[PDB]
């Protein structure tokens, strides 16, 4: 059933599983028209499909062309997500197919179940975790590939860079969710924390800076401080 705080270690066992987050699939700007009505303009989106054990990210870019002449776009976006996750599963060799797919939003359960009827042994699960994967588009290299896309594209990343050389999957996922939660809460302040020291760069083949083990401890502390600072500003506490 539901993935929660109780069954958290399950994310890092040897059963292949993917998180699917659909938050950034259908993205719009809202604007006034000449006549003073309101219209939307879609921008490119993405499906965030992540293996929390290995860090493998299957970023399916959703080009604005897929919405052209379609109605009920917020509904269609869930079904398009499920269609693309199903296509990704069918594309993987049998031994790479997930045994579980965890959706971050309960509205994805029916669309994904119906697209995966051909895979009755792949469990489709919701989660009680509040995961910050909406903030993926705060990672400059992910935002850049999404915005530059001129057609539907799949781009593969390792969202943990080389961290698993030094830390466990549990710790890498904890670091990732902390960084994304900070970027979600105060993007400008989070990015300043990450880029503040010019001597620490992002490798061409990485998403995040090349921090030493001691620098990651400082960065993680600064991210926790940002989140607490913002909670105090929000609630006047």
């Amino acid at each position: 059933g539901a993935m929660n705080s109780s069954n958290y270690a399950e994310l890092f066992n040897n059963d292949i599983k993917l998180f699917v987050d659909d938050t950034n699939v259908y993205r719009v700007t809202v604007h006034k028209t000449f006549e003073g009505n309101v219209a939307t303009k879609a921008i490119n989106g993405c499906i965030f499909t992540l293996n929390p054990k290995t860090g493998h990210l299957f970023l399916k870019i959703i080009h604005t062309s897929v919405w052209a002449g379609q109605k009920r776009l917020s509904q269609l976006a869930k079904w398009k997500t499920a269609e693309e996750v199903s296509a990704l599963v069918r594309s993987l060799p049998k031994e790479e197919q997930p045994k579980q797919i965890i959706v971050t939003r309960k509205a994805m359960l029916d669309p994904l179940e119906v697209h995966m009827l051909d895979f009755p042994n792949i469990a489709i699960r919701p989660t009680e975790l509040r995961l910050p994967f909406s903030a993926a588009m705060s990672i400059d290299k992910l935002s850049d590939v999404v915005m530059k896309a001129t057609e539907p594209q799949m781009v593969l990343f390792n969202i943990y860079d080389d961290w698993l050389d030094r830390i466990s999957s549990y710790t890498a996922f904890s670091r990732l969710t902390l960084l994304l939660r900070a970027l979600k809460t105060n993007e400008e302040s989070a990015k300043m924390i990450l880029l503040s020291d010019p001597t620490i760069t992002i490798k061409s083949y990485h998403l995040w800076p090349s921090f030493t083990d001691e620098q990651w401890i400082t960065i993680e502390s600064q991210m926790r401080d940002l989140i607490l600072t913002e909670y105090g500003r929000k609630y006047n506490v």
């Binding site: 269609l76 079904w79 269609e83 029916d110 669309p111 119906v114 697209h115 009827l117 051909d118």
Partner: protein, 300 residues
């Protein structure tokens, strides 16, 4: 007018005949039911006074044979049997009628209720749902599970309703996932009507039989089937106008007949609110909507 004689009534029991019911005392001189209208299926049903567990009963058509009830003290129930000797059966009935030991099927001339509840119900379709080919009548009780309930345990004693499952390969064409899930017209019209049932009359027969088993026996699997067959039509954007009009008549009489005090156990809030207020057919069931709003406004 046909007759179902009773050998005796050795245990105190509430006897149903269609929508009617009569209390019989232990060793009361009761010898059956006369003046049963020819042209319809009927159900004769029982609830023991000393053990209201197992409601049970028999579906039958007096056109298909001469049927009588006899209590079996070994198996502890009233059993339907067929009498193959015509002249013996006629002479037993004549004696019991002359001694006025039979209740009369209490049909009011103006009253079409039983026709309205059984319009599409055929004994030959009942005998395929309830499989016991050596009898011309069909035993149903409160505890019998459906083939669908059994999938999710003795298959000889199951209710073989047609399996309806909205999240199944049968309901969803590969490539039309969103289409078929949000609009069940494919599943209703091609799979169910053209494919399995062959016509709307057979589909309505099974829907009507499910309701009656739910109502008369409190058979939970039958209630599930009745609601699934309603939901399948109401969740289809494309339904023949004659089927929508007939469904509104079918459901109106079913809601009319339901005991007010069983609405909490026999009506599914989600299905009825979806069918009357959200579905493609929310404006197609005017008579049913009006009786539901006036009789069960709490459920809605």
């Amino acid at each position: 007018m046909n007759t179902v004689p009773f050998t005796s009534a050795p245990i105190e029991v509430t006897i149903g005949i269609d929508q009617y019911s009569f209390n019989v005392k232990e060793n009361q001189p009761f010898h059956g039911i006369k003046d049963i209208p020819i042209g319809h299926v009927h159900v004769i049903h029982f609830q023991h006074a000393d053990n209201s567990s197992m409601r049970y009963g028999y579906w039958f058509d007096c056109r298909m044979g001469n049927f009588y009830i006899q209590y079996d003290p070994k198996d502890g129930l009233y059993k339907m049997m067929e009498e193959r000797d015509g002249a013996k059966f006629e002479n037993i009935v004549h004696n019991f009628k002359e001694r006025q030991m039979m209740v009369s099927y209490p049909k009011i001339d103006e009253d079409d209720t039983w026709y309205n509840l059984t319009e599409f119900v055929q004994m030959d379709k009942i005998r395929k749902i309830v499989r016991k080919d050596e009898n011309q009548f069909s035993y149903v009780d409160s505890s019998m599970t459906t083939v669908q309930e059994n999938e999710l345990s003795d298959p000889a004693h199951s209710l073989n309703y047609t399996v309806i499952n909205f999240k199944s390969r049968e309901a969803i064409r590969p490539g039309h996932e969103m289409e078929d899930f949000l609009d069940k017209s494919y599943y209703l019209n091609t799979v169910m009507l053209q494919g399995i049932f062959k016509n709307s009359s057979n589909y309505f027969g099974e829907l009507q039989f499910a309701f009656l088993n739910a109502m008369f026996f409190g058979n939970y699997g039958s209630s599930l089937q009745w609601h699934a067959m309603i939901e399948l039509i109401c969740s289809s954007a494309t339904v023949p106008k004659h089927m929508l009009d007939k469904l509104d008549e079918i459901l109106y009489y079913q809601i009319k007949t339901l005991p007010e005090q069983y609405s909490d156990i026999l009506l599914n809030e989600r299905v009825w609110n979806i069918c009357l207020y959200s579905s493609f057919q929310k404006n197609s069931l005017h008579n049913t909507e009006k009786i539901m709003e006036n009789k069960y406004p709490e459920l809605l």
